[PDB]
Amino acid sequence: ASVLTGRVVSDKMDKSITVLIERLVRHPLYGKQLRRSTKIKAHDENNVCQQGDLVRIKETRPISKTKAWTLVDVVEKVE
Amino acid sequence: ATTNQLIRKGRKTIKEKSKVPALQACPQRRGVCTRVYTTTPKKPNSAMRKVCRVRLTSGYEVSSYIGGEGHNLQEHSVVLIRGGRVKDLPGVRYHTVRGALDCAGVKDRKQGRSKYGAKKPK
Amino acid sequence: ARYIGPKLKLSRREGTDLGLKSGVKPYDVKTKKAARPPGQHGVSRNKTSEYALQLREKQKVKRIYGVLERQFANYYKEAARKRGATGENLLAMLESRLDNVVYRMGFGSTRAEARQLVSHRTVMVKKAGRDEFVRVNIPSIQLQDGDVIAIQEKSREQLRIKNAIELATQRGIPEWLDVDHSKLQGTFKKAPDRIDLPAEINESLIVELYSK
Amino acid sequence: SMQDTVGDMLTRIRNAQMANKVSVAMPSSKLRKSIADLLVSEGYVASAVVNAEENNKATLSIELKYFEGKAVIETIQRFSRPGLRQHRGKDAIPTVKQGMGVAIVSTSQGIMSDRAARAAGIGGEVVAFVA
Amino acid sequence: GLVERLVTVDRVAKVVKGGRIFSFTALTVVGDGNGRVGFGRGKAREVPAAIQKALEAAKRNMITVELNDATLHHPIKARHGASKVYMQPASEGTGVIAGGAMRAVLEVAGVKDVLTKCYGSTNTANVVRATFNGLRDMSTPEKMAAKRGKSVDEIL
RNA sequence: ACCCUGGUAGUCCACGCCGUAAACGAUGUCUACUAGUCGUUGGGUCCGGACUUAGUGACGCAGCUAACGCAAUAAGUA
RNA sequence: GCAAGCGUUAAUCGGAAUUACUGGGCGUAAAGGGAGCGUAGGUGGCUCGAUAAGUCAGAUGUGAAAUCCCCGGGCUUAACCUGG
RNA sequence: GGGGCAACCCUGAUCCAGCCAUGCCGCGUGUGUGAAGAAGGCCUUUUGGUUGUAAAGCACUUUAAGCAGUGAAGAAGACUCCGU
RNA sequence: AAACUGAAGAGUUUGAUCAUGGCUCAGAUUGAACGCU
Secondary structure, three states: OOEEEEEEEEEEEOOEEEEEEEEEEEOOOOOOEEEEEEEEEEEOOOOOOOOOOEEEEEEOOOOOOOOOEEEEEEEEOOO | OOHHHHOOOOOOOOOOOOOOHHHOOOOEEEEEEEEEEEEOOOOOOOOOEEEEEEEEOOOOEEEEEOOOOOOOOOOOOEEEEEEOOOOOOOOOOEEEOOOOOOOOOOOOOOOOHHHHOOOOOO | OOOOOOOHHHHHHHOOOOOOOOOOOOHHHHOOOOOOOOOOOOOOOOOOOHHHHHHHHHHHHHHHHOOOHHHHHHHHHHHHHOOOOHHHHHHHHHHOEHHHHHHHOOOOOOHHHHHHHHOOOOEEEEOEOEOOOEEOOOOOOEOOOOEEEEEOHHHOOOHHHHHHHHHHHHHOOOOOEEEEOOOOEEEEOOOOOHHHOOOOOOHHHHHHHOOO | OOOOHHHHHHHHHHHHHHOOOOEEEEEOOHHHHHHHHHHHHHOOEEEEEEEEEOOOEEEEEEEEOEEOOEEOOOOEEEOOEOOEOOEEOOOOOOOOOOOOOEEEEEEOOEEEOHHHHHHHOOOEEEEEEEO | OOEEEEEEEEEEEEEOOOOEEEEEEEEEEEEOOOOEEEEEEEEEOOHHHHHHHHHHHHHOOOEEOOOOOOOOOOOEEEEEOOEEEEEEEOOOOOOEEOOHHHHHHHHHHOOOOEEEEEEEOOOHHHHHHHHHHHHHHOOOHHHHHHHHOOOOOOOO
16 A cells, blocks of 8 residues: 555564665755655564665554554565 | 755845834834934034934834924823934934824925825915 | 816827817917927926836826826736737727727717716617617726717717717728717727827837836 | 766867867767767767777767857756756756757657657756757 | 937046046947947047047947847847846837846847846946847857758757 | 163973964865966986976966956866 | 825835845955864766666546636626636 | 424524725716916016916816616515316 | 746946945835825
8 A cells, every 4th residue: 555665774672673764855945856764663573674674664553652664575684 | 055055054044123123013103202302413414403202102212303393392292103214313213203193293384294294274 | 086187288298299189270279389398497408318208108198098097007917918019908908998989989079078978978888799788987998899889869969979070070080990970879890900090109118117 | 086977078078169179089988979979960060989999998089060160069058967967847848049059858768859858748857958 | 320329428537636637438329220239438528529439439349130020039148247138038019128228239229029137237338248249149040050050940 | 662782481302282373375175178388396218309297387378357367286168 | 296095104025146046156355164084975987787766758546615827707897706 | 504393483604784095996076169378376588488278258068976766686486275 | 729928227435447245216015004185
């Protein structure tokens, strides 16, 4: 439905990971695209992925106070 | 002033403050005269210009210029003060409105009557 | 409002005939003063500036048709918006005014007397497509392609209308208007073209003035 | 160092024509050849031939034109620089000299003139204005 | 059959032992109204002699401009020193909306409708010269096509 | 005060502070391109010259500049 | 010159390219940090591929109505109302 | 819109009216004709200029306001009766 | 068919000049106030 891709910058929570999604939001006056980033905490039920991995996360019903996304696929892993 | 420098700091123009702070963005304010004196203008020219120091309802106490030939203002006279500075007078940025509340219109005015609160002669 | 005061000191300020007096006398005989502007001095020194030939060119068109600034600046706003040349869309809106047309057709000795006919409910207009002859008292009605003008039955025996026709024939009748003296009826067939009005009016000065 | 290869190309052409040089040469590249080829087909330069040099290097030589002793390329300015890229849609391509000049546009169908992009109804990166 | 118009008359002065020697400078723009235009400024102790001397300097500094039959062919941006001018073609009936210095050269050169704007310093002598450079540097679609060896149809 | 006769801190050394100068080319750093002429420093390669480099100077086109002036060591073209 | 209004004051934008994105400058007019190394960041050689995120195009959904603009229609005209 | 089977009731929402040139728009305060170019004012070189066809005079017109009539549309046809 | 139409400068530093640069002005707008009407 609504899937998002980004790296894992933290995984030191039980059944939870922090995902850093990058976007290029363009300045509304000067036209240069600035690469910004937001930290989205997703839910990793089995707690398998570590930090530094590519993960797809989809929006779902909230699982915690500040957690409403869940891990669906780990396309890439730390080298 | 590169593109990267503009999306970091950005042009910041500065707005000028009001030249008539006592009015508080109002067209006119009423006040009470605490002193009605005369003073001398600056270097280039000479005269005895009539000035009234008035305490306004905004909490400011400024000096306004009584324009016209003759007036009837004393202490505790209730006057309307508008904006507009007098170039020759240092520290006078307001004009008293003639005909408004206590200030009378200029007695024998004929041409610019509405600027001096004078009724049309019959 | 409208201008009520003397008419031959308006022309004199413009330096040309404005048709503010019915053509029974030559323009230089009705006033005989028309070399010097009105007032004490009139014809003197000082070099006129670019703004003065702009103001005087727009003041002149306003005095010809009898329209004040606010109603006349609205016309320029309609003419600018409107597609095509501004200074020619402006001259059409002013020539399509109902009070101007009952003078181009011959029922008014002058636009001021034609203003006194439209306003006093003595002229009926019929919009093209409708079949009724409404009475109107609005000088500034913009006529359109096909509108028919007719004099009111009550005031069809007017002694001032009868001699306004006689005097119009000498002045002539335009081709964008079809008049019927016997039936006291006309037709606004078409708005006049730029080459159907005098070439002494410089409409480019009018558009030049309304841009600061 | 050099961080605008396209800007260097145009600067070489701009200075060579200012100096009335017969031809301008520079290390070659497909992006440079693609722009140089468009300049030839637009009629701004005589020809542009690539000579394969040693150590897998190439030289792009452009033959310039002059009309009545004046350079044919009156102005050649870069629009989309690396510090600020400019991508435009099919209806936002800026014209050069009211259609007389060429706004070189990099579309998904390759480098081509702005009049070609509008005909194809396609946008792209407006890389330069040549007039 | 040439159209002449005076742009500005300025009073200048030179200093000597006894005092000041005042002279007058006049800047004129002469033009055919059909594409031929030229400016010149003359100096004399009297205004009529400064005006007359300006006219003769302008009739020898002339250029022919190929206009788009009512207006310019393409937007123009020119400069002379510190005055930056800009002109773009306008639709018929727009009129020459320009400042006094820009209007004089454009009106007498035959332009009837153009959009202008003057940047930098608005010195009449330099603005007239900056506009004069822009009109002389302006190009025609026929000239652009022939320059590239193509036709006007091949170059929209 | 300038001038004269003396004269102490300082100037010198070691170790630390200070962090400022008309600390200037009143010209940020790094690239590429654009007539030329004459010096000079450290190389190099050729035949006393010639050429080519990396500095350091004096001029001088185009170009730029309000002007002064800059001008391959740009204040030119990007 | 405006006109049942006309002036004055207050206030916003404009003119001001006078914060310059469009669209300015920094030798001497205000403006190069005393110099350097370097973190974040910005930007970045050539060739053959892959991907399609940016970019571009198309389709679909949505972007309320009113307002703005265009073409009309009704108020005697206009302001006003109004259909697409 | 609320209640009621309805009748009907309630509704300072709303639909209107009042006050204010506060704004936008429209109309008016007349129109033609009138010269040895009256007088009065103002200037002046003391006699001319100007106010100026402006006024007076003469011939008209009645928008708006006033007076008197007439007079749509905003109303959706409730109830009751018949028929299917 | 159309919505696609739009860009003005001036005064003021000097004995004079060009540049720089501030200040001021002409425009539009208002739920406006005030003065005369």
